[model samples]
Target: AYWLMKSEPDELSIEALARLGEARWDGVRNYQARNFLRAMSVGDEFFFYHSSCPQPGIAGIARITRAAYPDPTALDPESHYHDAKATTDKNPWSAVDVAHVQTFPRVLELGRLKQQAGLVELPLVQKGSRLSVMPVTPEQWAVIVALRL
Candidate 1:
């Protein structure tokens, strides 16, 4: 399944993804978001959204570079995402790796998406929708790609 992953440009920008070629996606705290990470496979595709930036929207393409693994931070007491309730033998958090594909020439702004009739039902544009990681249907993907064309 296709998905969208949001990241604050300052914390982890598309440029950084480009530089690294691929990165281990970590620090996800929400359970639903964590589930999405677990659902991903090595070849899954994603749209990299630049949130909390001057332009918050899809900025690039990324693919699942690797499958899910226990988030190391959850096992480290000193780590920011440390889970005191979690045990190493049964890790409670997980993360996947995403490899950079290509950045869009321009951000397909969130506002623009909300205004588009075809994208009105998009989860990213829904009220109170704050999921950092979300699924995107093939239809949604086609519409967005068409916009870039």
Candidate 2:
């Protein structure tokens, strides 16, 4: 399935993803986000969205380079995402690594998305929407990519 994953640019820029080629996606604490990671399989496509910055929007494409794995932070006592209730044995958190695919020539701005009649019903544009990781259908992905073009 295709998905959209938001990252604060300041925290981890799209450039970093490009430089790393591929890196483990970690530190996700939200249960729903964790579930999304768990649902991911190798080769799943993703849209990399930048949020909580000057311009929040889709920045690039990525692929689920790796399947889900137990999140190490959940077992690390000093880690910010650590859950005392979580353990390696219990595996309370999960994550997947996404490889950078290609950076968009231009951002698919959230405002533009909000204004598009085709995208009006998207969960990302809905009031009170706060999911950092969200699903996107193949049709929606095609529509959004075409908009960027």
Candidate 3:
């Protein structure tokens, strides 16, 4: 299944992913979202959605380079996302490796996506929805890809 994952552009944008080659996607503290991260398999693709920024939108696609593993940041006391209770053997958070796949010519902005009839069921457009990671149905994926340019 396809997925939609959010990140702040300043933290890690699609452009940055392209330059980095691969990165460990971490800092997700939400249990449900972390579960989604763990569900991702190698070779799975996801929409890289930019959030909490001026031009928030789906910037591009990325492939899962590695599956779920303990997020190293959670064990580092100096890390912004560090968990005081997280130990090497008991860390509750997870991370996945991602590689840039395709960067769209333009971002599929949130407003445009909300306007599409085919995207009515997408969680990203729902009221009070704060999920940072969620699954995208194949049909929904097709609709979004069709708009990529």
Candidate 4:
């Protein structure tokens, strides 16, 4: 299924993924979001959304290169995403590997997306919903793809 995944540009922007080729998408703390990550399959496409930044929006597309796996960062006390309750045998968090697809000419700004009547159902535009990872329907994906150029 198509997906929408938000990351602060500073954390792991589409630019960063482009430079690295592929990287682990770890450190997701929310159970709901973590489950979304786990539901992903290799080759599934996603909209890369830049959140918590000055110009927050959908910045590009990316493909999941690997499915969900235990996030090691949860076991490292020195890591920002470390969970004190996590054990090597029982890490509650998950990570996935992703590769860059296409970076849009410019970010499809959140306000612009919020204005789309077709996208009102998207979790990103819904009030009080802050899920970092979410599923995007095929129809929704097509709507955004048409806007990407």
Candidate 5:
């Protein structure tokens, strides 16, 4: 299975991941997004999208290096993603570890993707759907790769 994951470049840039080698995907507050993270398995691949940035789009590819685990950021009050209701015993939010795959030569911008045939049905284009983490079908994934090429 495949996935599309969004993150603000300023918050967790693809370049940052290249430097760290790999890092935990965290700060996902929405329950739907959290479950998406929890559902991921090691070896899963994803589009590393740069959201909430000047050029919001698919910036690169990443592969899950570790499966779901408690999101430590959700338990830290100092963290922007902190969940007050979360506890050591019951952590509602989870995160996964992913490694940099390959950076796209240029951003496959959201608007541009919408123009493509196979991508119109994706949540990234549909109005009122703002899931930061979403499932991507093999067909949709191929379209993305083709766009980058």
Candidate 6:
């Protein structure tokens, strides 16, 4: 299955990931979100969304460069994402690495997505649907991709 991974542009935007080449998708602490990360496999697709932006929207697509693994941030006390109780052998958190696939000249802004008939079922639009990472069916993926065209 495909997935939508939202990142605040300042933190880890499509441009940022593209420049870095690849990066460990970390700081995901919620159990359900963590499970979503753990469920990912290399080559899994990503709908890179820029959240909390002036014009929050889907910026581009990416591909998983690596599968889920222990999130180092979860072990570092100095980092905001660290979980002091988490251990190397029994960690509850994990991360994945994603590489940029492509970027569009413009974002398919959220306001625009709300008008599309194909996006009514997407988690990104539903009331209180604020998951930073969530599943996206192939049909939903195609619908959103079509918006960029």
> Per-residue lDDT of 1-149 in model 4, one digit per residue for the tens?
79999999998999999999999998899899999999999999999999999999999999999999999899988889999999988889999999999999899999989988889899899999979999999999988888874
Best by lDDT: 3
lDDT of 3: 0.94
lDDT to native, each model: 0.87, 0.85, 0.94, 0.94, 0.89, 0.88
Q: Write the per-residue lDDT of candidate 5 for residues 27-144, one digit (tens) a residue.
A: 8888898888888889999999998889989999999999989999989999988988999899988889999988888999988988987987788888898799998999999988
TM-scores of the models, in the given order? Answer: 0.94, 0.93, 0.97, 0.97, 0.95, 0.94
List candidate 4 segments past 4 Å from native.
none
lDDT of 6 by residue, 1-149 (tens): 59989999998889988899988899998788788888888899989999998979999999988989999898889889988799989888889989999987899899888887787887788888757888888888888888887
Model 5 quality (TM-score): 0.95
Tell me the lDDT of candidate 6.
Answer: 0.88
Selected candidate, larger lDDT, 3 vs 5: 3
Rank the models by lDDT, top first: 3, 4, 5, 6, 1, 2
Clashes (candidate 4):
0
**Candidate 1: regions farther than 4 A off:** none
> What residue pairs clash in candidate 3, if any at all?
none
